[PDB]
Structure 1
């Protein structure tokens, strides 16, 4: 049920079976035996359990957090606004971590799926993770154990001052 856009998978191209020898293929009979012995009972059990679940279907909801004023607009020693901004920044940190995780998952799956052509056919995912990693490192790395929204803001300001100095 995962979104294909979020977790892209290249379309599957499976070669058709083209036997050229008379000898019977053991894999085919073994797979048929496995089907009959295992897959059918398992499919029946899941049919039963899905029927039971459909008998009592109930829904759980994904929470929505409205955007709150950032530390940038929070006043000094204004503990309420600083608190809200800090919790929001922590949630954003978690979301960014998850995004990095998604990109890394794509990278691993593409390495495995391509096979011996991983170096060439996974280049796009490698570039995506390159960009995401650079952004994440710039945003969050070196903040330290006691990372806080204020420290991230300070890092951003240091970076922008360096950029202005580079602009000379």
Structure 2
């Protein structure tokens, strides 16, 4: 369906086997499917067609709000309240977007497990690696900030991580 993006929400092509009956007995599943299509599918389709015809007469639109980039806390001077406010708001919006990215990856993982069914341990290894990488990055970003998290705390954590990496690299090179 065109409601979502197939790249963002992939689905492998669906291979449905063709029916190959081997008995003369009638198929109750087929008979009940035909009855269901006759009694339910056609009325709901007619109702939806009427509703969608009504909708097309009053077609109006809504837009996606766009936010421009602003200087971040690394550029903000010390105790410059306006720049700090702008940077904190931008950081919070980026945090929300990252949370939604993690949610998308988790939805991919769940859908792939359910789809593969009995062979999930092997066929879902591709989506498990992406989730592992995304979770690692998200944890390194916002792992232990606390309830009163802020862009300053995230920046201090990043500085600590960078200093630790530099120390490890220097020790290795020594």
TM-score by length of 1: 0.99
Deviation track 1:62-93 (CA, whole Å, cap 9, x = no partner) reads 00000010100011111100000000000000
Corresponding residue to 2:122 among 120, 123, 127: 120
Query: C-alpha separation between the residues in 1 aligned to 2:94 and 2:20?
Result: 53
> 1:47: how far off?
0.3
After the TM superposition, which residues 1-168 of structure 1 pair with which residues of structure 2 at under 5 Å, given as runs? 1-168=3-170
Query: C-alpha separation between the residues in 2 aligned to 1:14 and 1:115?
Result: 15
> 1:165: how far off?
0.6
Query: C-alpha separation between the residues in 2 aligned to 1:57 and 1:70?
Result: 40
> 1:51: how far off?
0.4
Give ranges in structure 2 of 5+ residues lacking alignment. none
Deviation track 1:65-122 (CA, whole Å, cap 9, x = no partner) reads 0001010001111110000000000000000000000000000000000010000000
Query: C-alpha separation between the residues in 2 aligned to 1:141 and 1:53?
Result: 46
> 1:160: how far off?
0.2
Give ranges in structure 1 of 5+ residues lacking alignment. none
Q: CA RMSD in A?
A: 0.4
What is the count of residue pairs matched by the alignment?
168
> 1:133: how far off?
0.1
Divergent runs of 4+, >2 A: none
Deviation track 1:16-74 (CA, whole Å, cap 9, x = no partner) reads 11111110010001001001100100000000000000010000000000001010001
TM-score by length of 2: 0.96
SS of the aligned residue for 2:62 comes to: coil
